[PDB]
Design a protein around this ligand. Sequence first.
Ligand SMILES: Nc1nc2c(ncn2[C@@H]2O[C@H](COP(=O)(O)OP(=O)(O)OP(=O)(O)O)[C@@H](O)[C@H]2O)c(=O)[nH]1
Ligand SMILES: [Mg+2]
Lengths: 707, 13, 360, 48, 31, 95, 14, 49, 21
Amino acid sequence: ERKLHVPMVDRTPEDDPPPFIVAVVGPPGTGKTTLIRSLVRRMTKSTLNDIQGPITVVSGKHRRLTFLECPADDLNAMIDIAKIADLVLLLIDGNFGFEMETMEFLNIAQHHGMPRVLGVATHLDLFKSQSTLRASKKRLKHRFWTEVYQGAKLFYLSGVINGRYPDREILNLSRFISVMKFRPLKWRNEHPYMLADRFTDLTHPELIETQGLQIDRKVAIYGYLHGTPLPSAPGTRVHIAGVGDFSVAQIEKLPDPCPTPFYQQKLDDFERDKDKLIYAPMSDVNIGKLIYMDNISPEECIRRWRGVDLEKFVPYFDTFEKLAKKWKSVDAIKERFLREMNAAKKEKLRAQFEIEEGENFKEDDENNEYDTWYELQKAKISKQLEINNIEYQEMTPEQRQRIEGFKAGSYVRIVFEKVPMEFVKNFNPKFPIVMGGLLPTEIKFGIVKARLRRHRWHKKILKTNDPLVLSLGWRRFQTLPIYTTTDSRTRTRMLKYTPEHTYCNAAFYGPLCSPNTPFCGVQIVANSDTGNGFRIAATGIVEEIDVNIEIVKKLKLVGFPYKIFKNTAFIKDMFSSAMEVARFEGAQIKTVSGIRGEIKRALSKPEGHYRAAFEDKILMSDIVILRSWYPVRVKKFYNPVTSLLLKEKTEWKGLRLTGQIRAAMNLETPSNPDSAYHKIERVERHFNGLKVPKAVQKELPFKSQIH
Amino acid sequence: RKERLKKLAKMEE
Amino acid sequence: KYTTFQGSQNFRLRIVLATLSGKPIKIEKIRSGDLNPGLKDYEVSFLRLIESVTNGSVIEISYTGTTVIYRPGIIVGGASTHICPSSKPVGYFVEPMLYLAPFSKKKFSILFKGITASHNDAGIEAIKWGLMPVMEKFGVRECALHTLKRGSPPLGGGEVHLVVDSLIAQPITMHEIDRPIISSITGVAYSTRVSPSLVNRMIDGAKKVLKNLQCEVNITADVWRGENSGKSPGWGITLVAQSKQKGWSYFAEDIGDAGSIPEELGEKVACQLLEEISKSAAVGRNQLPLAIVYMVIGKEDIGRLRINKEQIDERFIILLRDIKKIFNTEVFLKPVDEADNEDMIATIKGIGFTNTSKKI
Amino acid sequence: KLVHDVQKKQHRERSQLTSRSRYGFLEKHKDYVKRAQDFHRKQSTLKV
Amino acid sequence: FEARQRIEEKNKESSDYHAKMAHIVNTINTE
Amino acid sequence: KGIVLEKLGIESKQPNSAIRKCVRVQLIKNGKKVTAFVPNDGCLNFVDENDEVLLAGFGRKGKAKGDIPGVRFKVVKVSGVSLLALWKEKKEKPR
Amino acid sequence: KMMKNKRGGVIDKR
Amino acid sequence: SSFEKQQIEIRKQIEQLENEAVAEKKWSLKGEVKAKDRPEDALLTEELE
Amino acid sequence: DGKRAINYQILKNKGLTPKRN
RNA sequence: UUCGGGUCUUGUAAUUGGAAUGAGUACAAUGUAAAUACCUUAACGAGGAACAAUUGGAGGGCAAGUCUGGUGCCAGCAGCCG
Ligand SMILES: Nc1nc2c(ncn2[C@@H]2O[C@H](COP(=O)(O)OP(=O)(O)OP(=O)(O)O)[C@@H](O)[C@H]2O)c(=O)[nH]1
Ligand SMILES: [Mg+2]
């Protein structure tokens, strides 16, 4: 049972898989750069300096790795590199212990599909006592075991001796990340994505001079591919994280810069770099063509091949006369329909019986596939994958480009137009520029119904109509969510806040993503004002997508009694005219005490008053209230964060929170004093005694009389 | 007495 | 408002594919050289139908009526009724619904009212026995087309309830590479307001032609009289050859005209079905576009269907060109190894297309 | 059984509007039912 | 007239909901 | 071990009724569908769709006021972590 | 009911 | 630049939203509305249920 | 210092326990 | 079990004192092949003694709240939602 699972699909090529991607993540001053340089120098026997941008090396005959030192204070970089990564070398200061950046990143990974996390602890050489050392390692390990699973192992790294960590511990780390054995995840194996390796602008410099350093320059992007075969026909939509949502102009594949030695030697075999074994560019050292030729008429196509409206349904036939004369007989279709003589009779009877039964009980697949419904499903998957394999292998140029496009691990360059000068200007190498092919559902806009809860570690709850910078799909954008409840599934009422410890429905405007999709939203992407508080604020999953919602806010009208009889009351101060009351006549009105009612007829001489009947003599002091609903609407704000376009690449400031603007404008948190609660103290009430009419009291008999 | 009566009702039912 | 299309060709197919894709289209020069240039009543009502069934779409139509602009939204469906104008019948107004049924946010319960047969558009029995099986093979299970009142040309007054409940996520990829073996010949011979003698005459004509074969034939007579038999009289027949092994069907139908001969129509449709058998390869020429669309929308994988060079025709050609213009999805064709015939496997990489409207 | 304390939290009792210290002690369901029982008692004995 | 319509629709919806819940609990018990 | 197919009683009205607490999962070593409890409609929220739940026996000792009979399984771990852990906010469900 | 529930529109001009 | 103009427009929209969100609520969006609080003779156009 | 040490809450991870004595 | 009965310095999120000590950290020594511990031990280390022990089980109550049914004013389901 333990080894069963939920069948999925592994869309990765057997043939030339790409370099796996390892993201080195953690707090700022924690030996992250040294860790990468030492890992590289172990795996390729070459000390390195000036590391920046994705650095791709090769391990073993069949593996190769892409290291990304993610920046140490950018929440947006954390989010997107965690969307894309595969192995997270998550690293921890030792003398200090766990840190908020680490916790935030771990949460992002957990919500977007956890990659193979793998923790390494540094600064272990500053412990004075080997006892505190041991206790602290054990505590880190167990807290880590809570976050990542249990038994997950972390590595320990004493001090740098010569700008490098000890060879033994690094050797163990290297072999582990050499037999890592990654696993399939829905988002990655449903989208195509790449992590750009090199960036090159493209315009003509005189054209730049003429336009005035403003024209939106063409851009070339070089890198491998991952996930799902990118369609090779130009003009697909790819979101570049933090830069915008573009569409590709021109595609082209190339020879990869660091081919695995197995591939290299197999290439040398077929035909009949050893010194640069790494790659850090961002650092320094026929019917078918007849079908699809457009300039040809379909008539021309068909005549050449042999040598019409589609609205009508019946296809084009010939004269019944010719038809019947042609087929007085059916022998030309009898084949489709269905001692030595005795043996032939037995064989034809077997054929008849095989047509009769056939694939009715052809092995059931079950005893064939080891009697485990999981493995049966998995066998279906694998058989489909191998069908794909052989059909693609059938033919070279089209099956590879026109049919499926560039599979994965195929080092491609792409050029876009209309890319901001700000991007090309402020682009520094230390940030990952990641691209993801979108989907139609993901290019449309509408409003999404999700369910989200306040993130358990965030100290404050989330008010409606306060902007939330959420991350969903490849995107990060700021929106105005509205949090709704279903009053036991009668209507969708807006709440004023977020339940402290449970999931409330939310609805908000923004780009659409397929249902059942997880997402997580923060409040402050700006490094400038983060404080010591935990950053991630909301987590949820999108349930459904549409273009509008019926969403209700409650409002009650308050009225006041001023002349009461038994069961009838005159209510003033609730409407403004007799037309108004007459529109509202016949209403379930109930008072604070809880006695039901209705408003019967609009009173005449006073302008708005009315007479209402209750189920009991209402007080004079009570208050009557009428429940009614009011439709609200969802704000259509959408402000997609673009830190890469920004120059600081942190302190992206968007819409401010309500409390923030109130403090800035020096207002007060509004509150009318009659809405507050108070410690009332209800005293006992002595009711008057009965008083019989004098008529009755005179008519009573003598015994049962008040003596 | 009322609290015991409620408790007894609960216990029986 | 971006992808351009010319002429009034395959209008419903283009609009259907626009909805399924999601990208905005624009069809210009609809019957420019006409005394009444522009659309027709049935096309306008078909756009009305699309607007009803979906949500959030935008339809722009030229004051000349010669160009139309389509910016789609998402499919919803729900329950509804439609009044098909008499110019075209309900089969014409149902086929696009057969395409868009099982990817909707809510099940389809649509009541069509109008005429229910014509020479150019699929009849009720045609839709049932000739397209529901294809959908079932592709994965949809609970699809049904009840016939409340059966009209006929030229007054009609017929009613059909189309119900679809199998909200799949995307059609299963298909693997059919072998010419099936016909098991039986089923048929429906219906009529409204005339003599069961006439219907039996059709039956005898068809069975007369088909006695040459040995496969069993069962044709059910469907005579309607009284009130729920619609206004005008009429008759028609529809034959299906069913391969029960994997559940495949090839069908051909027709309807009698004013002053036709029942036995003559019967022999015509019998020969006509068995013609479609001769030309066919795992699919009839008239079922084929449905099969292709379901393949191209199936999940990101290679599906295979064995077709014949006769099914390869200019209608197929224009269909595939429109599909490329919409989806950018080439279709690979590979000749079979068989030396006797010249069948070709059509191999299609269905893009990942998800029923992203359905709530969880 | 399986319920959070916050799920059992509390609900405070809002009091009479400030603009009516003249009509004191807005009435709630406990007090209404008390008075209703009393009045039913009186009606019963008068009918007797 | 509006009130008449509102009562009609509410009764229809409550009927539908009761039908659905009966269906679901029956499916639980028999499946 | 099972796969959550669909949550029954999403649309029921009174909260925390048995037909709310119920779901429907197919056991994977048989491909066989069976229904199963989940305490706390909150936990009903913690379990959503295609989730690889770990089911255990119910072993109820005495009936309740409206307990559905014939529902013998209870969900224990969802996508690999404990329902009580998630509910108590010790852990977080990893997608 | 129809205007309250529908969202998308048809624009007809002649 | 095009991005710069877009950010100018977004800034305008942000300013609008800020002032709107700090300003006073509508009589309708409040709760427990009273006859003098709300505008005179408005319900019969507001058309609520 | 610029380092953001983790909160006690998230250090100890006692999620939702009732009141005790 | 209801009528009631028995019995008695008890009750409190009330104030307040100066004491004791190891979890821990640590000169040193002991220990050990070498160490890390243990055992001894200078200077440190306790009032939310925040130096923040749990894992289960049972029951109550609260609203201008919500849902559902009724022989008024009630009953049920329930209540992080006023
Ligand atoms: N004592 C000790 N110091 C370490 C250790 N690892 C790293 N350091 C110190 O940390 C510094 C390394 O910082 P980086 O290598 O740049 O790691 P980083 O995350 O890239 O730091 P940033 O450049 O600020 O991003 C070195 O100067 C070392 O002195 C360690 O294991 N022990
Ligand atoms: Mg560094």
